[PDB]
Coordinates of C-alpha atoms in Angstrom, one line a residue:
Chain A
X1 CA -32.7 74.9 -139.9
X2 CA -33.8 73.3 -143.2
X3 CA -37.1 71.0 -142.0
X4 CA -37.3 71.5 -137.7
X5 CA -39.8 73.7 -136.4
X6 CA -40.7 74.5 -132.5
X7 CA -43.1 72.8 -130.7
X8 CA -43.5 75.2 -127.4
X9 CA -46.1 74.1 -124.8
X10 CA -47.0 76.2 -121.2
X11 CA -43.3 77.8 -121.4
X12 CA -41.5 75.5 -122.2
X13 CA -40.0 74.2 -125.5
X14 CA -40.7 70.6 -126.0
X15 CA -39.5 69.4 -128.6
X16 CA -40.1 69.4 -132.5
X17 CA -42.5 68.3 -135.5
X18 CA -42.1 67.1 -138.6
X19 CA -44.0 66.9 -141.7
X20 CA -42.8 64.5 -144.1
X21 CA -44.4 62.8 -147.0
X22 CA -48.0 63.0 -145.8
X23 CA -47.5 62.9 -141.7
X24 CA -47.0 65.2 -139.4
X25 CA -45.3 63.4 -136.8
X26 CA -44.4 64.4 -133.1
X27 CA -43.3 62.2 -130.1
X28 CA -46.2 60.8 -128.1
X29 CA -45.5 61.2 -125.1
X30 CA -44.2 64.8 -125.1
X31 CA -47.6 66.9 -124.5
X32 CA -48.8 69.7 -125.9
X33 CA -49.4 71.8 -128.8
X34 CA -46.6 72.9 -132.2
X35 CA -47.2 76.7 -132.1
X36 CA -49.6 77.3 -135.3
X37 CA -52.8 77.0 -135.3
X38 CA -53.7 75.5 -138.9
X39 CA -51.7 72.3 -137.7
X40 CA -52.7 72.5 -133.9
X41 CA -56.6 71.5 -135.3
X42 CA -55.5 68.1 -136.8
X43 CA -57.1 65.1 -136.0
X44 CA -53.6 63.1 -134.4
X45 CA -53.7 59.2 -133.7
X46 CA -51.7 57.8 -131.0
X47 CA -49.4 54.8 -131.0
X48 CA -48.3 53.6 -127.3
X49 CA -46.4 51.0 -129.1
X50 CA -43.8 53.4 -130.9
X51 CA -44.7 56.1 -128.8
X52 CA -46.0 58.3 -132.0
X53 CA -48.5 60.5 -133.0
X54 CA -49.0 61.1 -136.8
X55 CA -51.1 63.2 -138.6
X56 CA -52.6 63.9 -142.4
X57 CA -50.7 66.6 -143.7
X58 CA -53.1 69.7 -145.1
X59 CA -53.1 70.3 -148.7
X60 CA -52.0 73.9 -149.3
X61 CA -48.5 72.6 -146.8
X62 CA -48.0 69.2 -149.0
X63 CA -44.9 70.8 -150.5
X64 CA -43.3 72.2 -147.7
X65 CA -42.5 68.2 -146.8
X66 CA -38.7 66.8 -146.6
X67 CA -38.0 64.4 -149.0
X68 CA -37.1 60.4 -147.7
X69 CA -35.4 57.7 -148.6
X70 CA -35.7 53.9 -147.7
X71 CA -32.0 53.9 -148.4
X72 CA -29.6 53.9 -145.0
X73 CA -25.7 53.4 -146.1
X74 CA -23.2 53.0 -143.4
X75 CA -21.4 55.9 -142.6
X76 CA -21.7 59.9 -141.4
X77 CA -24.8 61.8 -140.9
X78 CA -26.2 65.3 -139.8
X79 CA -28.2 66.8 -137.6
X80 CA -28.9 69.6 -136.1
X81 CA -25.5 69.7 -133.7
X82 CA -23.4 67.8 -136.0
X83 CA -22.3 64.4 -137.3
X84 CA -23.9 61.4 -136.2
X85 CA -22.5 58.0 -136.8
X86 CA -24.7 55.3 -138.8
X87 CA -22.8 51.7 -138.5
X88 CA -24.1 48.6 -136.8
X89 CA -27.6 49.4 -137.5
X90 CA -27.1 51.9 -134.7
X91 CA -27.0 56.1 -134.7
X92 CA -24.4 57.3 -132.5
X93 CA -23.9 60.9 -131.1
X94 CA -20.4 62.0 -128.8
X95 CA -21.0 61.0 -125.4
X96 CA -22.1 64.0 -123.4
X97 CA -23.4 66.2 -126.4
X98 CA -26.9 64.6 -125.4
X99 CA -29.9 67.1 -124.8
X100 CA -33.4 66.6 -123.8
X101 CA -36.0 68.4 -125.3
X102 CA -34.7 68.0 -129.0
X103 CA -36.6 64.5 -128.7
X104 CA -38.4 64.5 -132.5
X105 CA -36.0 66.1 -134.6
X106 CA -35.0 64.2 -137.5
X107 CA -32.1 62.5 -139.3
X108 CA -31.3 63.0 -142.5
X109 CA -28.1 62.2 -145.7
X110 CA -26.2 63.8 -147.8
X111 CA -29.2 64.8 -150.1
X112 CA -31.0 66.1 -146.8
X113 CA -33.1 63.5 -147.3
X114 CA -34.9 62.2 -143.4
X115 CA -34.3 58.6 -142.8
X116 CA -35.4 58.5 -139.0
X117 CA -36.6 60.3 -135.9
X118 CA -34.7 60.3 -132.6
X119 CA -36.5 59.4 -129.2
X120 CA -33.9 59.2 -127.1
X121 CA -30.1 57.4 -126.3
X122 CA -28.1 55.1 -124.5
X123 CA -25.4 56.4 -122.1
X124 CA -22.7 52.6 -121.8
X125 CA -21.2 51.9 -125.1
X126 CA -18.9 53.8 -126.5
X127 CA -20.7 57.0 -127.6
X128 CA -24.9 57.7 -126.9
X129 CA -26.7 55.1 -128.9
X130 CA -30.3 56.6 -130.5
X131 CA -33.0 55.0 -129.8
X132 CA -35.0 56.1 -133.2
X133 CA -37.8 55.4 -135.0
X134 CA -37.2 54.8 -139.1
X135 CA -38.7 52.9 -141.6
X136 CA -37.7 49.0 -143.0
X137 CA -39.2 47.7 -145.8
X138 CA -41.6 50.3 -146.1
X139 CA -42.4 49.5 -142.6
X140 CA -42.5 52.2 -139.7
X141 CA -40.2 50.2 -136.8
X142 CA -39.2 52.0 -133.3
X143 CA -35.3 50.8 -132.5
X144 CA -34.6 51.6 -128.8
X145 CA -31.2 50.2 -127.5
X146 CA -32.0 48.6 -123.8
X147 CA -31.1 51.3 -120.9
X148 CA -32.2 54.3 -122.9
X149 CA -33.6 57.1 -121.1
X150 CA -35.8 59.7 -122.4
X151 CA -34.8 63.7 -123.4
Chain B
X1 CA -48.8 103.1 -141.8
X2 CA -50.2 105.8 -139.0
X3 CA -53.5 104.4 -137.4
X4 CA -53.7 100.9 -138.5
X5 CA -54.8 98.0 -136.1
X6 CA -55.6 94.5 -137.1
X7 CA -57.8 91.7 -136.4
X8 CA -57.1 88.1 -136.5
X9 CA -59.0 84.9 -136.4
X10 CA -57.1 81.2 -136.3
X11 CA -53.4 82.2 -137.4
X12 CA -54.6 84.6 -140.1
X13 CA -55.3 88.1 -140.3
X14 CA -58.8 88.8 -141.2
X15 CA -58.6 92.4 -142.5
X16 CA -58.3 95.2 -139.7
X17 CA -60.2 97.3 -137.7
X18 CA -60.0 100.8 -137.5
X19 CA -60.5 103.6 -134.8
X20 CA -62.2 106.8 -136.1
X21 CA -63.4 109.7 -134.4
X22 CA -64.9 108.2 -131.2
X23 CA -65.8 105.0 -133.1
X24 CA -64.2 101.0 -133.1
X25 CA -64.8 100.1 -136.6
X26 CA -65.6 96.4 -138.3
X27 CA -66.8 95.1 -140.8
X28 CA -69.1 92.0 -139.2
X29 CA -68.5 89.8 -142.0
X30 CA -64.5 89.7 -141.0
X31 CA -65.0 86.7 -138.1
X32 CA -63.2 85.9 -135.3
X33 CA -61.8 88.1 -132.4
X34 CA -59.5 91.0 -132.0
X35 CA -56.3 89.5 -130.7
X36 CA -55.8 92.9 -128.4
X37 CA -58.1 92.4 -124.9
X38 CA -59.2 95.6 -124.6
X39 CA -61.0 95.9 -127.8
X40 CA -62.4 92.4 -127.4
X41 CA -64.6 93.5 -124.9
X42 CA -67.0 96.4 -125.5
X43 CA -70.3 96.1 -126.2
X44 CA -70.6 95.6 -129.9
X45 CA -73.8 96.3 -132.0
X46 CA -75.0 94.8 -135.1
X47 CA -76.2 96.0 -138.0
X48 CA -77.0 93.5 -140.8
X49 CA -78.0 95.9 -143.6
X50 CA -74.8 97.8 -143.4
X51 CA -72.3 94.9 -142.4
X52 CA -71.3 96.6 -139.7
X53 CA -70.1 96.2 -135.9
X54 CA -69.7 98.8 -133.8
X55 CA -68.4 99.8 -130.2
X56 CA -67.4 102.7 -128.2
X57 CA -63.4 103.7 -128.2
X58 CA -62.4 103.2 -124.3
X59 CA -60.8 106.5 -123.0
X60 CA -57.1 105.2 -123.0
X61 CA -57.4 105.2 -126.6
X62 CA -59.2 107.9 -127.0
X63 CA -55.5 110.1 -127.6
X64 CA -55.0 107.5 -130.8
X65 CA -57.9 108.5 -133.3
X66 CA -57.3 109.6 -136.6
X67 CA -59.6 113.1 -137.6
X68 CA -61.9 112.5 -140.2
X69 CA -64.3 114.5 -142.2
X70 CA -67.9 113.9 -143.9
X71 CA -66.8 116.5 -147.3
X72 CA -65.2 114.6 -150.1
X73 CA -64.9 116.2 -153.1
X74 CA -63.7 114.6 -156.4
X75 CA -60.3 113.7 -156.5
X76 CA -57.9 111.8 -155.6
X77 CA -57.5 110.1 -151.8
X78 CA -54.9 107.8 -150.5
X79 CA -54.5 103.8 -149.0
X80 CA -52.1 102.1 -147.4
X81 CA -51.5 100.4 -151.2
X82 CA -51.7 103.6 -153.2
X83 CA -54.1 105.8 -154.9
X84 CA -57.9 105.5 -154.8
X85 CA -59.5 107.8 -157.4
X86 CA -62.9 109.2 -156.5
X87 CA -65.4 110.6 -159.2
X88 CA -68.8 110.6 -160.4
X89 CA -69.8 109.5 -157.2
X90 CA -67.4 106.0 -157.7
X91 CA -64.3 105.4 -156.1
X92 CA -62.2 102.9 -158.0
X93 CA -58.3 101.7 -157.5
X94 CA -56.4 99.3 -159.9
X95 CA -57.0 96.1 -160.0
X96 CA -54.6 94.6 -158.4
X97 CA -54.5 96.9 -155.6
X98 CA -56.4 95.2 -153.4
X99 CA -56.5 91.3 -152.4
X100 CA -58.6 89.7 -149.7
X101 CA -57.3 90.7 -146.3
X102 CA -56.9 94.6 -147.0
X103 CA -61.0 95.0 -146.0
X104 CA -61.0 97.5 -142.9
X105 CA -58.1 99.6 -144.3
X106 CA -58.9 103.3 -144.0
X107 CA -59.3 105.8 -146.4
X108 CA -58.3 109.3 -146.4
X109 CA -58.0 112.3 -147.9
X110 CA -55.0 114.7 -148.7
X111 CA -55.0 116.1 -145.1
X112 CA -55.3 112.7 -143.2
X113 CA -58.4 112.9 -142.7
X114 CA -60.4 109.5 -143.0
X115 CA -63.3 109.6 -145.5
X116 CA -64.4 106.2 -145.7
X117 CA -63.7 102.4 -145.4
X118 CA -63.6 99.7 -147.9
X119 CA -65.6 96.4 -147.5
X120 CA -64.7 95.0 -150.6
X121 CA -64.7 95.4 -154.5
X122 CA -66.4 94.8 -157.7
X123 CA -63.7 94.0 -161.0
X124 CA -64.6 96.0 -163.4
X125 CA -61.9 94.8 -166.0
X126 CA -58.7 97.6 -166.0
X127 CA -60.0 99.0 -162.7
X128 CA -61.7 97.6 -159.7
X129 CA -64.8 99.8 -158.2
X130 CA -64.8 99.2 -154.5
X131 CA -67.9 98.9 -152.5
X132 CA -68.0 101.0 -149.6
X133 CA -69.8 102.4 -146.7
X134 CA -69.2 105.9 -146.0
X135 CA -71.4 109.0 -144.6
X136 CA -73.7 111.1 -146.1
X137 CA -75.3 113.9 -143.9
X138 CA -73.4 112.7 -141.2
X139 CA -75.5 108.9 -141.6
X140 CA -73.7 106.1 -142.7
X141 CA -74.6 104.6 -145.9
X142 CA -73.5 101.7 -148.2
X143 CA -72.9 102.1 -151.5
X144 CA -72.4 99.0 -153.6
X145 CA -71.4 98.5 -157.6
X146 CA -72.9 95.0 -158.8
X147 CA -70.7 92.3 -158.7
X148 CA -68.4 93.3 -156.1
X149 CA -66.6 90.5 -153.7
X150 CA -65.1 91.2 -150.1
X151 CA -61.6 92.1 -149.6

């Protein structure tokens, strides 16, 4: 618990927000509402492409944002459950330790600092390969493995 | 903390409403809707001059009220935030004391007894004179110190 906060729509939790720099960013196709109301009254575009849906971030909340980086070195990561695996240009999780429904929380270093947003993995490497969203020379670019399914 | 109830309009409170003999007390400036559904749906009247909305308590709440009583002699009286000094027909509080949100607050004597409820203040430099409507052979009545801004 540093950055994630619920997202809960008709009984059911459904995933997580973020606010970051000046976005508040949520998973497209997950529907519904995050569960306070000075957010819930944003104007949110849509983006079938990455399957995202951003937001303007309200002034009196700017400073409650997670710090980024453009910087992604090789090596170990955390989350929420754990390490996660960075090499190959690919996140990695332990096979099995998969969940849907945490679809939209985020990666982040050492420095807690977010460097993407999971959508999803890859059940036949090794270990569950992410299929994440993160940005590239300054550039917001979805990476989905083929075969992923959605949590 | 004995008969307090609050109101609440998009995420934040709005001050409180209070029940007093057989009376549901409002200020109508505080907007919005009471977040409890059976308060929500008496029959409300307005009255512009005195800021006021007003309904009937419903009988399964009738066991709830707080006494009250139309005497006040000069003294001292009690809020949820402290002392409130009444004399020479002003009641004042330090500044300080009171902050927007606390409008709908009761106050009340030495013996529990309501007296009166604030609908905001005027700063006064060291001290802060609230206005306040409050009875006067047995008719409500506004009393207001210039320059005074809603709680």
């Amino acid at each position: 618990n540093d950055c994630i906060f619920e997202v809960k729509h008709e009984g059911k939790v459904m995933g997580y927000a973020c606010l970051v720099g000046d976005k508040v960013m949520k998973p497209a196709h997950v529907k519904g509402t995050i569960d306070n109301a000075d957010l819930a009254k944003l104007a949110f575009k849509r983006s079938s492409k990455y399957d995202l849906e951003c937001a303007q971030i309200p002034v009196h909340m700017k400073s409650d944002a997670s710090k980024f980086t453009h910087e992604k070195p090789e090596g170990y990561y955390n989350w929420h459950h754990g390490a996660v695996q960075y090499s190959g240009g690919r996140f990695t999780i332990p096979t099995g330790a998969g969940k849907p429904g945490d679809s939209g929380r985020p990666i982040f270093d050492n420095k807690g600092r977010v460097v993407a947003i999971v959508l999803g993995g890859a059940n036949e490497g090794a270990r569950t390969a992410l299929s994440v969203v993160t940005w590239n020379k300054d550039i917001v670019t979805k990476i989905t493995p083929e075969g992923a399914e959605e949590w």
